[PDB]
């Protein structure tokens, strides 16, 4: 899989019109979350979105979302200091993708975003 083939297959599974040109950074809207997919670093498919965090949540509660599990697609909660925004993301190797990998990754990312609400 190349980035272009992975994206094209994803869009087709999502019943989305295929872009005449597949840009290096793709944007998909699932419900209220605008997700972004890109290859960074080379050989890795990165997906991310800007969720809405809860004040009530303390550092411990926010950090609890980042504990590892058996699912490597579980998203990581982070913060973009420079832009002053929280960033939720997940990532997996392009060289081990199968037909359903990117769809699963996107699903896990959004489910992660929704939980934070």
């Amino acid at each position: 899989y190349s980035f272009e083939q992975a994206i094209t297959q994803l869009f087709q599974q999502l019943s989305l019109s295929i872009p005449d040109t597949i840009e290096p950074v793709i944007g998909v809207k699932v419900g209220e979350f605008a997700c972004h997919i890109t290859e960074h670093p080379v050989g890795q498919i990165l997906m991310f979105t800007l969720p809405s965090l809860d004040n009530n949540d303390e550092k411990e509660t926010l950090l609890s979302h980042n504990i590892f599990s058996q699912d490597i697609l579980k998203p990581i909660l982070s913060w973009d200091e420079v832009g002053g925004h929280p960033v939720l993301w997940n990532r997996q190797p392009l060289n081990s993708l199968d037909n359903n990998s990117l769809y699963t990754q996107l699903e896990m990312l959004v489910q992660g975003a929704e939980r934070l609400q």
């Binding site: 290096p24 998909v28 699932v30 419900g31 925004h85 699903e107």
Partner: protein
């Protein structure tokens, strides 16, 4: 030199009960939800996203 990393001496240590348990940590999966949602190909990009994007991309 030999037997060290990060200017620190290295040694093997028997893992305790807490480490062994945390190491096998699992989380029950969540049911599907992508198929039952309004999905659309982004027509535009937010402002805070462009900067972020062009900043690290």
């Amino acid at each position: 030199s030999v037997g060290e990393m990060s200017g620190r001496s290295v040694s093997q240590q028997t893992s305790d009960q807490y480490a062994n348990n945390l190491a096998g940590r699992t989380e029950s999966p969540q049911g599907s939800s992508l198929a039952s949602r309004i999905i659309e190909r982004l027509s535009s990009v937010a402002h805070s996203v462009i900067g972020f994007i062009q900043r690290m991309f």
